[PDB]
Symmetry: C2
Subunit: 248 residues, 2 copies
């Protein structure tokens, strides 16, 4: 099993992602895709006269009901269906689901934001066995059955640990972990270190935020986590080959 | 099996629909929900600066001109806003709803309109609209047997794998015939089928299938009325015991429809 998280930053090449994911899927490679839509959500929210609000912790989208609706429109409607269609065009039988569907992702609500603590793995296994490629996305369902915004990177990490994935891939609009340049990329980071809280305490906010998903995964057993470019062709195959930042 | 189609007209009481569907589901009544989102889509389209454009067909029927951008707005509202709103409402009521569009797992597949003619008579092209001719029944059966309540919506997937806008009423009718549904329920913002729409006085309470001897029987009926009735008649002929057109604004909308409130075609 390989879990692939498609970032929501501007520039993601969905066509290339779909093409590569489908190719791997047709070969028999078990796959779970998780995507986002932050950048596109901010734009639509703007256009709808409801400017995003982030609050700075010691960032996170201030999620009120209206914002959650826009979030769903973009994540669950625009991006999820765009990717499902692209995959179908490539010959992969994709099925798109949000955390609300069949109670796929359940967690605690903190503001309609929260965590994911439980996954309906039985539903995913049912679909995987029936020959479908799950394309997953937030929101999640709180213990009170309320739709809540949640961290997509953590969803992917949790899926990776539950399946003992051989590799967890994070695709973004950059070649990997950049300590904005591009020669400035970190090649490798041994699991032992990435897990150490002393190490993480020395990292810039940029990096500490981007690696938290990878941090949870390795401590959960995931053997390999890779941060790669989601703007290039064969983005997944290249990530699996070491291109980008490899953690293990 | 009971198939319920939630209309997209303005005024639908989603809370009431979800409460009723969930209560039936928790009582062991097998259900399939199909919904829409036309009114809310029009509003969002206007807000995003892409006003809806409709083609009045040579035969009276009106259809949304669906270019690529409109299709994306369509997906945002139907597949994002409405679908997830309903799934959440159902989960809150204790029904394990799972929302899907026709693209998902190739749930709904059909033919994309090669060309659309509208009123002199012109022919538009590049329209992402079509029909639904096949349903992935194995997928729905798999989910139903596993304890999930399907909440379905367009778009559909064309034979060329392109997302296409399609008639949700026909999707519901096809589903109902494939399952030999004991009832097909259409909920809207009116009490039922009005021959002199929107005159609620013109409500037709019962319509025997045998009465529509030939489609000519509806020659004098309004366009919509004609299409709604013929569709229902085909559904019944297709094996659906009864088709009901009822009010989706009231409490217990599905139960009331099943008890005969509204227009019943048999």
């Amino acid at each position: 099993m390989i879990v692939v998280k498609v970032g929501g930053a501007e520039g993601i090449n969905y066509e290339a992602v779909a093409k590569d994911a489908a190719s791997l899927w047709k070969e028999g490679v078990k796959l779970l895709l998780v995507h986002g839509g932050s950048a596109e959500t901010n734009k639509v929210a703007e256009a709808l006269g409801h400017p995003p609000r982030f609050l700075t912790h010691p960032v996170s989208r201030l999620t009120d009901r209206k914002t959650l609706e826009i979030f769903e429109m973009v994540y669950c409607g625009l991006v999820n269906k765009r990717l499902v269609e692209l995959l179908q065009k490539e010959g992969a039988n994709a099925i798109g689901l949000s955390g609300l569907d069949g109670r796929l992702f359940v967690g605690r609500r903190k503001d309609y934001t929260g965590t994911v603590e439980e996954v309906n793995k039985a539903l995913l296994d049912l679909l995987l066995q029936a020959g479908y490629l799950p394309v997953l996305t937030p929101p999640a369902l709180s213990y009170e059955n309320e739709a809540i915004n949640t961290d997509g990177d953590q969803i992917a990490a949790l899926l990776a640990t539950l399946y003992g994935a051989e590799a967890l891939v994070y695709l973004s609009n950059v070649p990997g972990l950049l300590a904005p340049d591009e020669a400035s990329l970190v090649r490798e980071i041994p699991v032992e270190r990435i897990e150490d809280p002393e190490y993480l305490a020395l990292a810039q906010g940029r990096m500490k935020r981007k690696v938290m998903g990878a941090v949870e995964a390795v401590k959960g057993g995931v053997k390999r986590v890779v941060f790669a470019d989601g703007r290039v062709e064969n983005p997944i195959r290249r990530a699996l080959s070491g291109e980008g930042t490899v953690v293990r």
